[model samples]
Target: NPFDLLLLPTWIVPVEPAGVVLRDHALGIRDGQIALVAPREQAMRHGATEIRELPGMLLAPGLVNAHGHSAMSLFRGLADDLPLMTWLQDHIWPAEGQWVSEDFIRDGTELAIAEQVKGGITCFSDMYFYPQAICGVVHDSGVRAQVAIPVLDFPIPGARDSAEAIRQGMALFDDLKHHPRIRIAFGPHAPYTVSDDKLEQILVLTEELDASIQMHVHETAFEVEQAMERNGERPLARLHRLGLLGPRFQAVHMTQVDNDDLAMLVETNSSVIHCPESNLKLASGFCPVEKLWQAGVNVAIGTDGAASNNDLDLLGETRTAALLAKAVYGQATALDAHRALRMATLNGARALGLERLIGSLEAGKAADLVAFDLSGLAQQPVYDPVSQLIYASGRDCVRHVWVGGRQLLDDGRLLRHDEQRLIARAREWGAKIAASD
Candidate 1:
């Protein structure tokens, strides 16, 4: 049989081609690629070894978490209700200094992956310490990811200094250059943390390697004010001056954007990653997502990390984004349901340069998908399935997940992870850390 698996869902939501929903459609996978997406009768004609009947489910592309610190899942609830700089410098940095080891990355990354997979995330971008450990866990967890080499002026857990971090990142790139599920990139922490010379160095390396750059830029007004006071230039402008703004650039937590910053983002064709929950948690400014989208900049959604957001729930995050966009713009129809789903799906894929790979449910794309159960009584009276999913249903509605046509989450239960063991391990770390604190 040409087809390996056939999934017949109640609703097939293809994010590409813009807001097309098919009822009674069947999606077939062959050799790990989306072979056919057709009506039930037409799809039934194709032969497949296994067929899954998904009643009252919406089959959509797997969510792409465009930015996160995977290993920081251990830090979830470690320090909450604090400002960004204080949280980082006082609590988080100290915790990392004391306990960020390979073991921590392995355990915490595993925890993060389990959470991601269970909640309909097949791919995420992780920027954390011990990136190689993160890569190993990602490879084995049967998930796709973009693992960035984190660079900062000071020493970190894995690398001694910024130079060592980039050097190690290049070596990591060479080693996993051909990993099917993992892509390597450079992460310069943020504008304030990384110096000008270091950023210029990263620009050269990224160009030479043909890699992408993910950075935290304009996260707060204070950050921008500090930059202006220092040199009368915005952080984004400085990056542009350093030749670091382009299609490959991903600006995360851009809660503050002026006209010049907007122009540079538009001119460079750069992507913006919005983490609404984290921004709200930190009292960070709004990202102007509606404006960015109107200006033709691809706006993606991210959960940031567990520490700030306190949860890696992309579904909830998407819902918050949709609601926030409408409120921020003072228009109820601002970021409608379809566009919100696209941000979590295709826009996220575009941000990571994986648009051609696993963003949408289209022919020839990787069969990375999620089957969301929308049959609950609370979610009844579904006018629009996408709308219900965004506004009503939660991550618990994520029933089945697949990456490259490989089944990982079956009926909301994880197939690859030992949930009991993971829970036990996480508790152990939490207890140890809690006791110390």
Candidate 2:
């Protein structure tokens, strides 16, 4: 009962003790949980059926992307160097209004999942329309997801209004609540797009049903100004009054906050999913991540929707977040290498309420693992595995990845997709988006 399968690697970064890395280590997996993790000699004596000993690689937990809109991958890089409002109203919304459908979501979601898996992400949190199609893509690709059901105040191709969105999203939830690898949540688009009545409705429904709530608030300095102009109060204040402040809330992009906002966050025990690259690309101000970290709020990192960040690489996102935090705080020690990695792994899992199952190389945790070939030209002279991974390593370092003990990527190739077709579909979407005036 000690081991069913063993994976011996050159180095192992468990991400629990912060910067602890063990050499010549192996992990034993059984029933999709890690059974043992120690040196190869110790693991071999535990009755492992197979041993995959990588002589020069580092094994770490597969990354958890705390927030995203997977189908937006179809629109990555469609418009760049623009303000948030222009990017959203002119490009993304128009593109969605014209091109979004079940097939579009399915193809785009599959492309995004394939890209993320190949880059070492085993689990992700998604908020988008056509969630059923998104779930189909995730299921076929054998990945873990917390797909947020989008309830917006406006009409879209999928649903007509807030009521329609909720009705459709709730119906989809009934089909996936008992699923093994998928969890569903309520996604109220934003406080700006959603009225108080709709937000209160979502609060009641999600609180009664005990579902996670994902929404965007305070993503930019202008957002705060707009809230003040309209309501004479901050976004957090309005949320608190609407009975929306709670532990189940996953607030995406708190780029503008004050002492009151922090107090509200602490009061509600809410979590923050910081999309650093997306904020910067959209000219949004950087969130005071160091301040949040010092305050003991669980702040996880995210790539956001691809239309903004243009890439769904949590590894890259963590690195940029680390550098940006240090610069924003004017402290060289801000978002240290170890904490950067933790934001992508452990903290992200906790943000999605998945810390107990995945996020680390612990016994009885899910056997979600990644092996990075660090013997390349750039990764040579790897003095510290943690620092190298958080600082120098990109998404290309991932060589092999597994989700729930099943191989989703091997030898830098995706195992669950028709590679040629996925590429062709992406090209088709890009052409369609590009052809639009």
Candidate 3:
């Protein structure tokens, strides 16, 4: 049988099977899925249409960003050094109110997709307004995404209220039901932003559609306190009462979780998407990643949004997650390199309910892979490829990236989008935003 493409890399890190890295491996691709992954010596016998022998490279499963506001890349660095509520109420929400639209979402999402691709992310979960615009970008970019339609009680870009948002979300979901690269989920902005009635309605729709729910929950100490004061219950407890805790639920920015919260997560089988850099930058407390993982809770990683994290680099984000876990738990062994890598790849895929499709570099999975050149000086003498990737390597070392057997990036050059043009458009938006200020 002929293969579509063959990748012979020095090291192959299959996130499945946990902590096993293969040497001199060749991954065979066919029909946009991984056909075979075996030793290069044996794989060479398999005929292929295209072959790439990557020396001094580590090929790993593509990273997944479990939570983000992709269109908010336009708001990167708009405001800094403020608490979460103040930042949203004072800076981000106001800017979004004035600037968010079809064009804004299109351009911002395009820019984010390019950045994330170059950073070795093949799949991302986005919760933003004007999601139809986001859907178009994801479809065109040859990337995978779960465009969580935003539902808030107040007016946003595409909808006037929660009801309108849910209606629109359902419409989009219906339209993209069979889309290969895109999945639609309900994004109820937060506990404080969405009303109980609206959340209940969303839960009904989710159950009817058998869809996933991604929301911001327990992001900060202030948010938990406010929720308790408002309803005499913490946000997680409120969510459980609302019948929103389950396997398909993803709670983002869980920086204020406790033992009870952990119990609820384990019992409900819900997942946590940790954004360490964003949390640290906003002073939003620690996520206790070590505790979550030790308690048998599934913990994925994300970079929040460029506005808060200043970048959408999952490799850098996982590196931060590894170090932060150790610091928070006061144990150097907390969240080692292999576990951190799994959080970025397999754990995130599990969070989005995409584990069987694109998470690991295994047979019958999508050919979503990234190759990082380990020849750089900083990455020299790599005793462990996974460690070098987590502790030493940055996004700049990313040499090639593929999504579903399509090469979206090669030798640091994007294949589908225009880097220069995207950068120029971003600058134009920056100037316009600055002038408005």
* lDDT tens per residue, model 1, 1-437: 65899999999999987878899899999999999999989888877888889999999999999999988898899978776778888888888888889999999999999999999999999999988888989998999999988999898899989988987898899999889899999988999999889999999989998899999999999999999998999999999999999999999999999899999999999999999998898898788888889899899999998988888999989999999998898888888999999999999999999999888999999999999999999999988899899999999999999999889999988988999999999999999877655
Q: Give a tens-digit lDDT track for model 3, residues 1-437.
A: 87899998989999888989999889999999999999988887989999999999999999999999988898898878876778889887778878888999999999999999999999999999888889999999999999998888778888988878887888899999999989999999899888889889888999999899999999889889987787889999999998999999999988998888889999999999999998889888899999999988899999998998999999999999999899899999999999999999999999999999988999999999999999999888999999999999999999999999999998999999999999999999999886665
Error of 3 at 337 (Å): 0.0
TM-score of each: 0.99, 0.97, 0.98
Residue-wise C-alpha lDDT for candidate 2, range 1-437, written one tens digit per residue: 65667898889989886788999778999988888888877778877777788777889999999999998899988888877678778988888889999989998899899889988999999999888888888989999999988887678768888788888878877888788788889888778878888888888888777888889989878778999998899987898888887778898999998999999888888899999998888777889999999998889888998888889999999999999999899999999998888898999888888889888889889988999888878877988877878887788989999998988998988999988999988998898789993
Q: Estimate the TM-score for candidate 2.
A: 0.97
Model 1, C-alpha of 172: deviation from truth (Å): 0.6
TM-score, prediction 1: 0.99
Candidate 2: misplaced stretches above 4 Å?
Answer: none
Looking at candidate 3, what is the lDDT of residue 377?
93
Q: What TM-score quantifies how close candidate 3 is to the native fold?
A: 0.98
**Model 3 C-alpha RMSD to native:** 1.1
Sort every candidate by TM-score, greatest first.
Answer: 1, 3, 2
Error of 3 at 143 (Å): 0.5
